[PDB]
Amino acid sequence: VLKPRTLADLIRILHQLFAGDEVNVEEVQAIMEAYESDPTEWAMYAKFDQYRYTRNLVDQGNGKFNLMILCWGEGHGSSIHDHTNSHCFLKMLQGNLKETLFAWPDKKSNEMVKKSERVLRENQCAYINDSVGLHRVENISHTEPAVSLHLYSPPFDTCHAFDQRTGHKNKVTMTFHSKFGIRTP
Ligand SMILES: [Fe+3]
């Protein structure tokens, strides 16, 4: 497996693997995972908020993909959401996220069912698309933050949040807390 020595290396390798029309999911996953998280390389992107997790754009991938870092304050979690028909890779950079995989709801209303539950290990890279299922991810810690590196292809700025009690969903517009290390409006 090709091992990126820096975050910069990883970005460059990603620019190659997504330059084409096919993407080898397992290959990307392994190369993401092989990069050893180095806080010195990504602290410029680690901009936290007291109340919610933040999304911090790192690279726009020549429109082929978005690479972003997500910052999870203590106890922070996402809603149950989909991924708008894109590939979605998420790699741990610091701390640990619990991923809860959910099945899709019917038109009928009732409680959503868990298909899987795991903690992402150190440097681990996970993968999801809409055909895999829905998920919620959560900082496991109420005393330490978590930081993850996310890659989406194609890029997408809307998704759906799902009410665990009914399965009803809402369109959500996703925003960036910062881009290239610079706070956004
Ligand atoms: Fe997600």
Euclidean distance between CA atoms 122 and 73, whole angstroms: 17
Residue 150 assigned as binding residue:
no
List the resolution, Å: 2.3
Euclidean distance between CA atoms 151 and 57, whole angstroms: 10
68 CA to middle of ligand 1, Å?
12
The string of DSSP letters for the chain reads ----SSHHHHHHHHHHHTSSS---HHHHHHHHHHS---HHHHGGG----SSS-EEEEEE-GGGT-EEEEEEE-TT-BPPEE--TT-EEEEEEEES-EEEEEEPPP-SS-----EEEEEEPPTT-EEEE-TTT-EEEEEES-SSS-EEEEEEEES--SEEEEE-TTT--EEEEE---SEETTEE--
8 CA to middle of ligand 1, Å?
24
Residue 81 assigned as binding residue:
yes
Residue span of the structural domain in which 127 resides? 1-185
Surface-to-core class of residue 98, CB atoms within 10 Å of its CB (0-12 exposed, 13-18 middle, 19+ buried): middle
**Residue 88: what are its φ and ψ, rounded to 5°?**
-145, 115
Number of compact structural domains in the chain: 1
Residue 28: which CATH number?
A: 2.60.120.10
